[PDB]
Amino acid sequence: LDDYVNTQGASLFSVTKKQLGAGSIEECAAKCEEDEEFTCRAFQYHSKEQQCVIMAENRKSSIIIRMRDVVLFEKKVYLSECKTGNGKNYRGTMSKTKNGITCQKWSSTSPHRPRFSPATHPSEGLEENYCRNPDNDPQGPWCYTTDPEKRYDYCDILECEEECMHCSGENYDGKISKTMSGLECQAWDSQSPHAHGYIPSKFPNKNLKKNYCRNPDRELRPWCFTTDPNKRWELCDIPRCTTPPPSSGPTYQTAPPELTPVVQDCYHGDGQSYRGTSSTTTTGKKCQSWSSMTPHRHQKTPENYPNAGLTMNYCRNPDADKGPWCFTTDPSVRWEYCNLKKCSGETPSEEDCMFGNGKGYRGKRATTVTGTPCQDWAAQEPHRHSIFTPETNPRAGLEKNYCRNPDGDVGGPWCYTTNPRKLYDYCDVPQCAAPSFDCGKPQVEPKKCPGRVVGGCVAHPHSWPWQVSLRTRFGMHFCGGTLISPEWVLTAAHCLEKSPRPSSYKVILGAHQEVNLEPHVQEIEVSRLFLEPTRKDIALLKLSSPAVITDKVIPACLPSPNYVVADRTECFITGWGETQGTFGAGLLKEAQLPVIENKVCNRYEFLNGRVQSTELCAGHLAGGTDSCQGDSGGPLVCFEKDKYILQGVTSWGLGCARPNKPGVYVRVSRFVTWIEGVMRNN
């Protein structure tokens, strides 16, 4: 299992294949290790059908294509083009020597008569003409030459990053769970005991697995977090490569952005007519580009399907399906369904609806996407199944033939069909409609200004509802804020330092213009003032009367306690700022600045250990802006799935916007436990 890489929803065209019945994933793995008829390299497994397929063809020889209910595991020993130490377990596709001589066949006796052959030595795996080491040679894997000048010669094969690291250790896959001092390594998946912006689900291409040493930010040597509470991260003393470094490419003497709409878009039946700007799946993962071939190699390109209009990483449907589909950036997950609801213009859609992936759905629906009559869960005809029955799974509520999702499939709820050709088919089940305006969900669609734009652009009218304009007694803007509850307003402590009076301050919500305010603008004066116990630049405000939640006034989403935003994630910052004469004087402006982790920012060229765990870092690493963007106490929001979550509070008394130096912000998640406590008691 450790030497096998999983690929969800992948199927290869095979001729030399063996099919038999299997219970679990581990049961199929036993057939791969034995190798009866042929040497296994890749195997297809069905979780619901319970039919395992043992194959010989790999991704290098055969073609990968999308398929429903399939998990594909591939052998790392056959995929690796680089040698391991002496090259005994080396199973590469090398067809040339170190000098430049063609490889001779192991079975062929002409021109040179060989000692090792597939008929005599099948355990070593002497494949056709490929370089193998059957006599435990320390130099490397050798092969027979075509020319009669020499009998055998060694080959120029690269070394793996398992025993020793190359240059800095960027593509390091070495399994070592120890630091230079002797401290134990921390798991990349878990956020305990140290919170970090390096999640393996968000960064699957960066080789982040378990607790092994990885270099994802161009740091000296492969670094990893420690279990000790005093030291957050420590460098590792891994031995350097004796073999030559890998070639970059030429030796002579752009990125897809998130254009996904916040308001859920609807697809017409199948989704062939749908032409939206969406680029987010049901789970919440970044989608692969149609023109690009990395990480998943496929045929579905704009040249093959021109009528579908396959552009960028947008949600489309060319060869027809029950819903829109597109490839993902994850090398372990090939394809996933897009997070899109059903069109407006069995059970009723108003009362009967599903939550999330439809795992906790106990509806009365019994109609498939095509309209095939649904087969009973207890019945064994025309489809025989041992798993997923009303006796095996008690925490699913499998009644008659109604829609129930126990495992949690990508295509929502699933059930058996009466047709013998189809085993199982997904159903058109509607999603739960929000009864009230949820936090971090604006009604007006934002413009979405890119990070490359210097300063920023003018935001859309009423696109940012959580923006709080803190005005004086007479009526003049000076500092900004953020709305979280109809009575609670979250801002910085820098604003309250000037005057500790509650009646003097006024709150303005749903404002676009600073000078001439909109006709529907709420004005509620502050009743109570609250400050942070450890004297940090963050403060809570209590309103005298609760604000009415409308299309113009919607609060911001609150994050989980102790959570750090991922590295280089595009985040929006709103506020009027220092307006003089630049395009949009007295108007609300938006700016996109990527969030950089504390580890990267604490280096000599940026901040030099001035940022603590409670402080957040946001800005451009190259080509920044001298002028300060937004207002003091402004909201820092990130687009996740279909909602904007407040992660930072603007404060100039810690770090300002500068070229090649990111600004210092106050992280909400670290103080979230304190914010929730005030709202609970009062």
Distance between CA atoms of residues 527 and 455, nearest Å: 36
Rounded CA separation 29/146 (Å): 39
Q: Strand, helix or coil at 77?
A: helix
CA–CA dist 543, 552 (Å, integer):
18
8 A C-beta contact, residue 429 and residue 545: no
Exposure on the CB side of residue 298, measured as CA atoms within 13 A = 26
**How open is the CA angle 28-30-35, to the nearest 5 degrees?**
105
Q: Is there a cis peptide before residue 111, judged by omega within 30 degrees of 0?
A: yes
SS3 at position 21:
strand
Considering only CA atoms, give the Rg of the chain: 30
Q: How many residues does the chain have?
A: 682
Q: What are phi and psi of 340, to 5 degrees?
A: -140, 140
- Fold match, 434-467+549-670 / 468-548+671-682: yes
Peptide bond into 222 cis (omega under 30): no
Helix (H) or strand (E) holding 65: strand 64-65
Distance, first Cα to last Cα, the chain: 53
Cα torsion angle, 8, 14, 16, 21, sign = positive
Q: In a 10 Å sphere around its CB, with 0-12 CB exposed, 13-18 middle and 19+ buried, how is residue 200 labelled?
A: middle
Calculate the CA 72 to chain-centre distance: 20
CA–CA separation, 298 and 59 (whole Å): 11
Retrieve residue 634's tokens: 């402004």
Q: Which helix (H) or strand (E) holds 599?
A: helix 598-601
Q: What CA–CA distance (Å, rounded) separates 682 from 493?
A: 20
At 518, the amino acid letter reads: E
Q: Report whether 238 contacts 222 (CB < 8 A).
A: yes
Report the CATH number of the 254-343 domain.
Answer: 2.40.20.10
Breaks (C-N over 2.5 A) in the chain follow: 253, 345
Q: How many CA atoms lie within 13 A of 149 on its CB side?
A: 5
Is there a contact between 76 and 5 (Cβ–Cβ < 8 Å)? yes
Residue 584 CB: number of other CB atoms within 10 A? 16
Report, as residue numbers or ranges, the catalytic residues: 494, 537, 632
Q: What is the per-residue DSSP string for 325-368?
A: EEEBS-SSB-EEEB--EE------TTT--B-TTTTT------B-
- Which amino acid would we find at residue 373? P
DSSP symbols for 85-149: TTTSS------B-SSS-BBPPSS--SSS--S--TTT-TTTT--TT--B-SS--SS--EEEBSSTT
549: Cβ contacts below 8 Å, ≥ 6 apart: 436, 437, 486, 555
Binding residues: 115, 137, 151, 321, 334
Whether residue 407 contacts residue 353, with contact meaning beta carbons closer than 8 Å, is answered with: no
Experimental approach taken: X-ray
CATH class, domain 434-467+549-670, is mainly beta
How does strand 266-267 pair with strand 341-342? parallel
DSSP tag of 224? E
Reference 611, options 543, 670, 530; nearest CA is 670
| Binding-site sequence positions for L-lysine | 115, 137, 151, 321, 334
Strands lying side by side in the sheet with 51-55: 4-8, 71-75, 42-45, 51-55, 17-21
What gap in Å lies between CA 524 and CA 634, rounded to an integer?
19
User: How far from the centroid of its chain's Cα atoms is residue 545's Cα?
Assistant: 41
* Beta pairing class for 457-458 and 42-45: unpaired
Tokens of 118: 């597939």
Q: Which two tokens stand for residue 511?
A: 């404002």
Tokens 């296994």 belong to which residue?
40
Distance CA 98, CA 156 (A): 5
Separation of alpha carbons 484 and 635, rounded Å: 11
CA separation for the pair 486, 140 (Å, rounded): 71
| Main-chain phi, psi angles of 338, to 5 degrees | -80, 140
List the one residue out of 490, 498, 495, 494 whose CA is nearest residue 537.
494
In the numeric block, the tokens 């990070």 are attached to: 451
**Residues 39-71, buried b or exposed e (16+ Cβ, 10 A)?**
ebbbbbbbebebebbbbbbebeebebebebbbb
Element (H, E) at 25: helix 25-34
Structure tokens at 622: 């190259």
Q: 351-433 in CATH: which number?
A: 2.40.20.10
Cβ neighbours of residue 427 under 8 Å, at least 6 residues apart? 365, 367, 368, 369, 403, 412, 413, 414, 415
Q: What is the DSSP string of 412-443?
A: S-EEEBSSSS-SEEE---PBPPPSS--TT--S
* Pairwise CA distance, residues 298 & 300, whole Å: 6
State the DSSP code for 610. -
Do the Cβ atoms of 165 and 212 come closer than 8 Å? no
Question: Rounded distance, CA 424 to CA 410, Å?
Answer: 14
DSSP, collapsed to helix, strand or coil, labels residue 410 as: coil
- Residues 331 and 207: beta-carbon distance below 8 Å: no
Contact (CB, 8 A) for 348 and 371: no
Other C-beta atoms lying within 10 Å of the C-beta of residue 481: 28
Three-class DSSP category at 168: coil
**Cα dihedral 186, 187, 188, 194 sign:** negative
Q: What is the H or E stretch that residue 153 is in?
A: strand 152-154
Q: What pairing do the DSSP bridges indicate for beta strands 424-426 and 64-65? A: unpaired
**Which residues does 281 contact at the CB level (< 8 Å), separation at least 6?**
287, 326, 328, 336, 337, 338, 339
Q: Structurally, what CATH architecture does the domain formed by 1-80 represent?
A: 3-Layer(bba) Sandwich (3.50)
The answer regarding whether domain 81-160 maps to CATH 1.10.357.10 reads no
Task: Look up residue 14 and give its DSSP letter.
Answer: -
- On the question of a cis peptide bond just before residue 193, with omega within 30 degrees of 0, the verdict is yes
Backbone angle region of 182, left / alpha / beta, with phi > 0 → left and psi within -120 to 50 → alpha:
left
CATH entry, 468-548+671-682, from 2.60.120.560, 2.40.10.10, 3.40.640.10, 3.40.50.920: 2.40.10.10
355 token code pair: 């939550």
Q: Are 238 and 164 in contact (CB under 8 A)?
A: yes
Which 3 state secondary structure label does DSSP give 300? coil
Q: Write the DSSP assignment of 502-561 as a string of letters.
A: STT-EEEES-SBSSS--SS-EEEEEEEEEE-TT--S-EEEEESSPPP--SS--PPBPPPS
How deeply is 516 buried, as exposed, middle or buried, from its count of CB atoms within 10 A (0-12, 13-18, 19+)?
A: exposed
CA distance 650 to 666: 7
d(CA 669, CA 459): 26
Q: If you search the block for the tokens 């290098």, which residue do you land on? A: 60
- Bridge partners of 43? 54, 73
CA dist 283 and 337 (Å) reads 9
Q: Residue 142: which of 114, 108, 111, 109 has the closest Cα?
A: 114
Please choose, from the candidates 584, 580, 594, 587, the residue with its C-alpha nearest in 3D space to the C-alpha of residue 639. Answer: 594
Overall CATH class of domain 161-248: mainly beta
Tokens representing 141 are 């894997």
Q: What is the resolution of this structure in A?
A: 5.2
What residues does each domain of the chain span? 1-80, 81-160, 161-248, 254-343, 351-433, 434-467+549-670, 468-548+671-682
Contact 331, 345 (CB under 8 A): no
The whole-angstrom separation of Cα 334 and Cα 287 is: 10
Distance, CA of 317 to CA of 355 (rounded, Å): 24
As a whole number of angstroms, the distance between CA 357 and CA 339 comes to: 10
Beta bridge mates, 471? 477, 506
Between CA 223 and CA 216 the distance in angstroms is 9
Say how far apart CA 523 and CA 505 lie, in whole Å: 11
